[PDB]
Design a protein around this nucleic acid. Structure first.
Ligand SMILES: [Zn+2]
Lengths: 138, 104, 124, 99, 208, 83
RNA sequence: AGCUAGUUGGUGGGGUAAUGGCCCACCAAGGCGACGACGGGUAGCCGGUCUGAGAGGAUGGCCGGCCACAGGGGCACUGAGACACGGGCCCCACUCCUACGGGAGGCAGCAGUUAGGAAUCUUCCGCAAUGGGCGCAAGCCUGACGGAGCGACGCCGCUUGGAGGAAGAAGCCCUUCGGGGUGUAAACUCCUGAACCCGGGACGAAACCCCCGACGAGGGGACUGACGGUACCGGGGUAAUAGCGCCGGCCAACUCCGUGCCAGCAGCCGCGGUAAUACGGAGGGCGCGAGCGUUACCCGGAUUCACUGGGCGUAAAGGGCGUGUAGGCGGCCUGGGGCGUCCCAUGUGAAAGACCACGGCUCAACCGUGGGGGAGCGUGGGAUACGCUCAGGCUAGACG
């Protein structure tokens, strides 16, 4: 059994994105899809789709990267340079608006998960709320 | 706001009064996780109404005896010493882990 | 440490280990010397050093060290301990207050006249 | 020396003798009612209880007892007296205790 | 007590030219002429590649000695700055420029904070008439900096305020002679002052 | 006996007071029920005295024998002057 | 590592302003503990202080708030109040007293005294102000206080001068013996005029009270200042204290003589055993300046206790393996509840401090008015993604 999907997902991704994989399915779930809905939306993967491997419902996350490179090492730049499940269980992490951070001087996001749904930080300030600090991409 | 409290009736075997467990959560002051601490209040029960393994309410009150300053505002729900059993056991192991250890 | 180990046990503090049990952490201790012997240093470098085992005004007593060229410390002069050591003379936890009490800095002084306590001259 | 204003000690003392005495009365006299009452002494008990009652509020009229003291003392008493007459009673002088 | 002693010396060692030397620091006499090398016995000998530190030190010194001001202030003032809102580097200079004395000097009632300050400590000057002197005087913007009556009748002063015609007064200044007055138009800024000091390094020396 | 007087806050020759309300039983410069004005002895300003009777009224609507120098000050601002 | 007899609770009662095992009687057989009881150790807690990028560490002097204490211990009377610093009773150590029976004593109040100590002052001034107590009042009382003295103990301002002035004095170090250095440095030229002297010389203070008129409101008028004749205002008024540390690397500033593992330096690794920029003085040099340097202690650097922000194959560091209690952690779906969680309103967060703006003593230190912020908690209200929770379902985990 997983001990915490969210985190797991983020990783499957993390682990996949690092070998320049076309796609990496992640076991389907109400939440997640969400995170991706953003993750994706926010231009951090062409998006994701619902695929049933073994009739078992998953989520194909469609990773993406930059272009090939010069000189020694033609591996494209990573689109998702960073990712970290901040509030894991075993040590929960809630923060209130004025508590939300500035992921990477603002070139990176944070994913709060308020009572107004899951949302980025700039979006948290928007509806001016705070919640449980989830992953943190940039 | 005279304090009120939901908790459990871990023990009655005394006169007119009762023992109450009252779990509690709150963030570790420094390590963030939410620790789930506990405390045994003594509520004053007259008709000896409330019984073992009862969820109930406690209320701040005018003394009745030292180590005894609350009362039973109500019965949240009956039957469920599953919580007691635990309490019971918590202190069960105890006495054993002195120079030899609890048990299981 | 799985948080929990921390919530549960948590980091152990520290503990300073005072190096001058000349007590009360005061900086100077009145005293009366007993022996006014003289020792050799540790392996690295050698030379006869003018120590001064002193009896402190606080039931304690040490191997007071005396600086400056020569000294006027007598087997029974009121001195004054003040810290210091010697990575040469094992077991010498302090220093002397030349100028205070029976001490008056070396008479052949002219420079760092604060230390080695001698006043100031009337040159010209 | 001679802190004159010391006086008070003197005073205190004097004033004491007064206080103590005022009280002792009540005690010694109050029991008189109880004892009587318990026995079944209609009047006298009721009677003397009045004497107490008063002398009590009397007491509590000066920096003796005052406060609620009076009440207590007072109540404490009749309360005591009352139930006590559950032996045939029949409040005579009554007065003290209304019905 | 400040310095008191071979000032042009400071120059030689601090390296550049230091005008704390009223006049003369204008022609074969600022020492810096054919004897710019630093003081000391060796002085005119090689100078080991300055310590990535020495630099912050000196550069600081410089911008300090310039004003011949007390370190306990030249530093205590720095904090007053950093504290304040604004590119510190600026601010400092800004405030380090409203020193009633320097102020005066920039005007022309004298030729050096060294000959100034004194000229300051004898009521010879006045911030808005009711006069002052405490060199350590912060001049807000838009203030009257006239002379001490009893002083108007004074050689130097008169002469200084006299020679004062052809030379200009910095864009945040404005006095005259036909009134021995003046005015603190506004807090200056880096540029405004030519100061041969790199404030940035200064800002730095105070992080160690 | 909740008075209304002055506690010192000035400085060694720069006395500055607040027209407080303590209980006397409390120091001059110790805790208090509420401030309500300041008095400047050396009057080096154009406000060496302010007050707010907006309050003094209720505040005098109960106990508070204001110090003689209290009613004084209060008098200028005349917590009184009921024309 | 297990503690408990007034110990846990009941009934009845005493006691107090008041609840109460606060105390007493009798009855039940309970209370507390690893979420750390009980014991031992150190300790007044706070505001705030220092320090830190902060989270955090360390602290709690002066000022403000609460507490306990008044030779060590116990009890209580008088009173609105105390278990009462300068009130009382007893008891013990102690000083003084004494006709030897028997007594008087409390500075942890201002100041002083002695003692221990590295160390912490004046036996002054004043009732003017502010406050406190009694008083109709006048008015006394006030070592609370407002001041002065004492201490470089800290902090802030300040003088030891200013301009010119030698291709550059003498005396004093270096040497390739040409010469380089201390230096515009001084001497000297005028200029200003600290200290010091002459005159005047307060704010702080307008109320109590007198008069007024209704001892109401409004108006007049008595008088009083310790500091102090000080601060300051005008006059004249003499160029008129510099010291301390450091100069091998970190670390800034190098030379010479002396010097021989000795004399000594030292925070560290280290220097001396004839050329030592490291030991001693000088020449100079750097740093700061009525200060400079040391000594001890707290924070920092020390991500070296690691929440932020560490680790465990060989550097210290995986428990000889298991089963498993408590405890921590939990799959996919829907609904209720809305405790965690977020949100708004309000209440609270004293004052001083610290942030900020203007202001006041010539500046600043210090000071006032104003503004802002402030986690936390209390009452109402709102949200439901997440965590829990309560009820229904599924089958990817588990088991069969
Ligand atoms: Zn020059």
């Amino acid at each position: 059994m997983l001990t915490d999907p969210i985190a797991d997902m983020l990783t499957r991704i993390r682990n996949a994105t690092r070998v320049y994989k076309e796609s990496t399915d992640v076991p389907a779930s109400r939440f997640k899809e969400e995170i991706l809905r953003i993750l994706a939306r926010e231009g951090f993967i062409k998006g994701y789709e619902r695929v049933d491997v073994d009739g078992k419902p998953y989520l194909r996350v469609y990773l993406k990267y930059g272009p090939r490179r010069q000189g020694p090492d033609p591996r494209p730049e990573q689109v998702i340079h960073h990712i970290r499940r901040i509030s894991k269980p075993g040590r929960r992490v809630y923060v209130g608006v004025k508590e939300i951070p500035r992921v990477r001087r603002g070139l990176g996001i944070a994913i709060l998960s308020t009572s107004k749904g899951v949302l980025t930080d700039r979006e948290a300030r928007k509806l001016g709320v705070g919640g449980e600090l989830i992953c943190e991409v940039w | 706001p005279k304090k009120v409290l939901t908790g459990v009736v871990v023990s009655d075997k005394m006169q007119k009064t009762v023992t109450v467990l009252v779990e509690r959560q709150f963030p570790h002051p420094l390590y963030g996780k939410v620790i789930k601490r506990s405390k045994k209040y003594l509520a004053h029960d007259p008709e000896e109404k409330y019984k073992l393994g009862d969820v109930v309410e406690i209320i701040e009150s005018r003394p009745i005896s030292k180590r005894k300053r609350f009362r039973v505002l109500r019965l949240v729900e009956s039957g469920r010493m599953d919580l007691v059993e635990k309490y019971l056991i918590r202190r069960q192991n105890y006495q054993s882990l002195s120079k030899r250890g609890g048990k299981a | 440490p799985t948080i929990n180990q921390l919530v549960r046990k948590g980091r152990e503090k520290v503990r300073k280990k005072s190096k001058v049990p000349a007590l009360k952490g005061a900086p100077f201790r009145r005293g009366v010397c007993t022996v006014v012997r003289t020792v050799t240093p540790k392996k690295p470098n050698s030379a006869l050093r003018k120590v001064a085992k002193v009896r402190l005004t606080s039931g304690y007593e040490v191997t007071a060290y005396i600086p400056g060229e020569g000294h006027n410390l007598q087997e029974h002069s009121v001195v004054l301990i003040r810290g210091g050591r010697v990575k040469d003379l094992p077991g010498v936890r302090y220093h002397i207050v030349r100028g205070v009490y029976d001490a008056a800095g070396v008479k052949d002084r002219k420079k760092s006249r604060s230390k080695y306590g001698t006043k100031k001259p009337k040159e010209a | 020396r001679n802190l004159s204003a010391l006086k008070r000690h003197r005073q205190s003392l004097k004033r004491r003798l007064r206080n103590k005495a005022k009280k002792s009365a009540i005690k010694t006299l109050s029991k008189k009612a109880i004892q009587l009452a318990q026995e079944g002494k209609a009047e006298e008990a009721l009677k003397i209880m009045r004497k107490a009652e008063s002398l009590i509020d009397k007491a509590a009229k000066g920096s003796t007892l005052h406060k609620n003291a009076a009440a207590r003392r007072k109540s404490r008493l009749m309360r005591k007296v009352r139930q006590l007459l559950e032996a045939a009673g029949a409040p005579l002088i009554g007065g003290g205790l209304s019905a | 007590g400040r310095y008191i002693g071979p000032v042009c010396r400071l120059c030689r060692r601090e390296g550049v030219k230091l005008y704390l030397k009223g006049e003369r620091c204008y022609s074969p006499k600022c020492a810096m002429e054919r004897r710019p090398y630093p003081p000391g016995q060796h002085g005119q000998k090689r100078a080991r590649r300055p310590s990535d530190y020495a630099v912050r030190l000196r550069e600081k010194q410089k911008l300090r000695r310039i004003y011949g001001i007390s370190e306990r202030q030249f530093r205590n003032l720095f904090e007053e700055a950093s504290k304040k809102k604004g590119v510190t580097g600026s601010v400092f200079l800004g405030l380090l420029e409203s020193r009633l004395d320097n102020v005066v000097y920039r005007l022309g009632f004298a030729v050096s904070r060294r000959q100034a300050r004194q000229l300051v400590r004898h009521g010879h000057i006045t911030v808005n008439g009711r006069r002052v002197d405490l060199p350590s005087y912060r001049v807000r913007p838009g203030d009257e900096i006239a002379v001490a009556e009893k002083s108007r009748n004074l050689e130097l002063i008169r002469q200084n305020l006299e020679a004062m015609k052809g030379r200009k007064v910095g864009p945040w200044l404005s006095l005259d002679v036909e009134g021995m007055k003046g005015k603190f138009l506004r807090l200056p800024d880096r540029e405004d002052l030519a100061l041969p000091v790199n404030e940035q390094l200064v800002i730095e020396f105070y992080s160690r | 006996m909740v008075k209304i007087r002055l506690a010192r806050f000035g400085s060694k020759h720069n006395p500055h007071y607040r027209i407080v309300v303590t209980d006397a039983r409390r120091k001059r410069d110790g805790k208090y029920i509420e401030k309500i004005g300041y008095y400047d002895p050396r009057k080096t300003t154009p406000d060496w005295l302010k007050v707010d009777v907006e309050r003094a009224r209720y505040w005098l609507s109960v106990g508070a024998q204001p110090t003689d120098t209290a009613r004084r000050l209060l008098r200028q601002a005349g917590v009184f002057r009921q024309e």
